[PDB]
Please model this.
Amino acid sequence: LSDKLKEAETRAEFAERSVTKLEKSIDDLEDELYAQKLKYKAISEELDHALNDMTSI
Amino acid sequence: LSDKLKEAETRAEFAERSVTKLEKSIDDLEDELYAQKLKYKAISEELDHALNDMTSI
Amino acid sequence: MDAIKKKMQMLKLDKENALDRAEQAEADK
Amino acid sequence: MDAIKKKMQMLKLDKENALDRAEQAEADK
Amino acid sequence: MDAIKKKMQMLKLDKENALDRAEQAEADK
Amino acid sequence: FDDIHRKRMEKDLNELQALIEAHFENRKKEEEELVSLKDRIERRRAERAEQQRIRNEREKER
Amino acid sequence: DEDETTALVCDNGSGLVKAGFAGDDAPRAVFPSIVGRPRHQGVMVGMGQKDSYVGDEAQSKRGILTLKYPIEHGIITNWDDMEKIWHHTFYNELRVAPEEHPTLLTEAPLNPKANREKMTQIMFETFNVPAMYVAIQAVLSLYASGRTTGIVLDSGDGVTHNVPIYEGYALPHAIMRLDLAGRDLTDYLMKILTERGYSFVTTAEREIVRDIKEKLCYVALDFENEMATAASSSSLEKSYELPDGQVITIGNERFRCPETLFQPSFIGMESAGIHETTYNSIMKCDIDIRKDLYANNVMSGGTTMYPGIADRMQKEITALAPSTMKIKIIAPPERKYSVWIGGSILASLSTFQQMWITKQEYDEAGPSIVHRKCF
Amino acid sequence: DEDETTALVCDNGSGLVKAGFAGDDAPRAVFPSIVGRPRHQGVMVGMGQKDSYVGDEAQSKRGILTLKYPIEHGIITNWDDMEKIWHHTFYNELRVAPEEHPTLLTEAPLNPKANREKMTQIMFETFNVPAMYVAIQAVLSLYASGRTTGIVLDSGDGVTHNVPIYEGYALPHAIMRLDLAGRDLTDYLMKILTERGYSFVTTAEREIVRDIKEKLCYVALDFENEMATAASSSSLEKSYELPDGQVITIGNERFRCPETLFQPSFIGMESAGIHETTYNSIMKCDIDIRKDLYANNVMSGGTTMYPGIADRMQKEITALAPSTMKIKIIAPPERKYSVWIGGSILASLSTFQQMWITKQEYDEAGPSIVHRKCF
Amino acid sequence: LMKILTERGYSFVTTAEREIVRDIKEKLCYVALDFENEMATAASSSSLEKSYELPDGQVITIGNERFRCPETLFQPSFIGMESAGIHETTYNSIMKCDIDIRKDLYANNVMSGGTTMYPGIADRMQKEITALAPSTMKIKIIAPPERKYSVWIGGSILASLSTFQQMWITKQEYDEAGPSIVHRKCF
Model:
């Protein structure tokens, strides 16, 4: 059980270390996502507005 | 040890589950995210490309 | 965008036409 | 539209100036 | 003290008004 | 003096055309190379991720 | 039961509901703006039991109810609970029916427009009132006090409004709407009574604290001196008897709560206090206005009934104000209920009978009509 | 970093401070004219925390700070805060200590003498500047725009000055100074957004409204027609993202706020608006001056960057002006940033080196010297 | 839990029994991310039951009580409390702060002390606050394995901090002022 435990703890800790990395990947991913959305939003909107106001040329 | 193993095995499962749940939500994140990532910049990028040409009048 | 293409050309034309009108009218006056 | 923001200023100013010239060229009599 | 609550308002208002008058009567010069 | 102004327009318009091209082309080259590269990195990571998920399932059975 | 089609007048605030008929000098009845609901599973059969209770019913059966107030710092959001409050107010108390009477309701000058539109919609669509008129609380506060010129200090349960009016005209740029009210004092007192070893967190506990505040609290003319003695001796303590027989002895909390009106930082508010907002609303007005507004700071609403409040604000305003000029607070006994009285005054003016939205104009335009017809 | 004793140049308004060095054609940095202070009691130990935050620090840490502006209606009322702003403005970002470089500060033509005297005193006694000059903002705008003649509208956050200048001469009898400004436009927007259900009363909330105004608002070429549609349909509404993820949707308020420039009565101001203010300055100048001032309406300061303002101001003056006459507005993209640029131009003119007050003359005469030397 | 274990035929009221139930709770209970679905299966099958060993060798088998207990955190009415739950209170602690504060508190929701060790609680809370929170905004929970021992750790950090040595009330100030001094000196 000790070996199974060390293996289960290895798996739990492996996975905990890995999930930590994945959680970090999510935090980074969401920040990247926000950057994609925010930049997209900013670009699509800056153009809708730039073209809606800048219509006379 | 049995309880620690059950807890560690339960945690091995929960932590590994969290790992495969996050690997999946991350993939399902990133994959859907790359779609945004590849299309928000390409749409905005091609919009800006087009703008250099849109503005050639 | 139609607004930019159509007005850039029309405003460009107002300029070109006005420029020619200035030269023409100035020659008359 | 940075290209437009400046081209817009260029053409509005150039047509307005050309038009001001067209109008004066005739108006001066 | 209901009698006071109202008499209190009466006298504070009446003295304040009388005092405001005393002060203005002199202050007006 | 007015030649300064002409020189300014010459460099600015030579720069404008160099810039319309450089602005667009530097992005199209970097950006399309980047997405093409990272579209592949994204796919390769997804493939590896699936393979690891499969590997984890196989170890769980082992 | 009325023998004339007199307008009904009602102030439906975040605290109390005041109601009566136009032409009287007081509301006929006053009760809390509460609709209560059971928070327990019934076990006895044939017990009656309502899905919801209203006003005094909500408080009378509150032992097993959670109690909600439909008006949030001056605005109506839970219009369904307010329909029940109005129905109770009109039919079970005044014994009138809006269908046979025009109705006047009131709100602060910077109250969101949604409030006036929803009140108009419900009175016309669910009560079939022949006419409606949403009045300004500041207008009604000065009518009741007898002024055409002055500052309305309406410091009640919802929001403090702080508006200067001159010769019957608004001076709106100088309005200092402030998120400091009697409702915050109830919650603050629950927290400082917790500091004393008597925690209060539930509805019943909140209603107990609101009762402690209403019966034991004051502000005092000099806070720091009152604080120094209350914090040092039992001679400034006052007990309160709770509904369950417990007794709480309260010391400087008795005034530290109410003092939040002058020191809003006690509840985390970014504000200099009600005396400064009064002062600045006058200072932003022209100098030929200021001479009349400083001499006519007018109290309306709750909290204005605390001992030392008129003297406390007059002292602070006077300290901030220039000399020679006189500074005065008008604080009549018709306090806390004076806006209702103002409603009666407005509703009964001959010059006001052309101000009503009729139930013709209402249906042709919809409830947004109040935004153009009332003010 | 500098290889010459170039003057340092700042344009310090009731809003923001633009800064850079003499001889450039642009500021190098901009700071808000803000000093922030915490309104909360620290609980944790060892988290740093300043007594006060300056400029961009004040806004970045604003969640718990009250934010104050040291400048109001064109003058410094709090110079201790301006000293912190100037250290930050000149040394932390531009990297130049005034001790080895002359400094140019700006003012409106009728700006109270006390303000130019303190600006002079502070830079000489606190920063040990070798020389000082306090410049007229209208002069600076005309230099930057390439004019010697025109009406300068410096329509920013503090005060609208409106001064006619012809062939480099002041025409002071025709100045129409007006207490109508960008800070009041913001206050109006806070009140009308309150009517829409979004009350703003704290510093964080005030800064949001100023951000809404700067990103969403415009004057419109024709206000009443623009309002007729904006107030009737969602087709002219624009949303704004609030800091917490919530949003606000704004209709005619989007242009009604800026409109106060043309309709000052919206904020209780006794004025016909900025276009009659401009027109009257032209009207009061000599008849052989008027033609050049009609052809040169000069735009500087804030609010000059609202959509529709350049076209609206030329149209509004044309509507007041005699026929035949050509009315023209000077409103290039570099509009308003003309005052900072002019400070740079003036400081570096060879014809202006004798206009610098040295720290020789200053100590012999004291700060009152600026009134004798700058203009 | 003592009351719902009574429903299952195992009443717990005495000291030994009270200590056992607390131990059962700590070892067997959880919240998970969906109460109603977890209840639908726990109430229908032995597959979600867990046995606990009592001190005398006897056992108790527990089903949906395993999650119905801690669910009181999200459903306080279970114990007769007038509350919407811990996620409503977390939300209000964030929401009642200024608008330029809210973003940082949403991103720093901190688990501390006991009950933070119920399986699914860190994510259950992030989900429940997210459900009340505005969209776009990132709601994040801080929930390290040093959960519940974090108060002790902070106590060590603060007590030993050089910047906090002046914050200690000495036994001079104490006798001059009396014990009420803690109210003025600690914060």
Q: What stands out?
A: The radius of gyration of chain A is 23 Å. Residues 2-53 of chain A form the longest helix (52 residues).
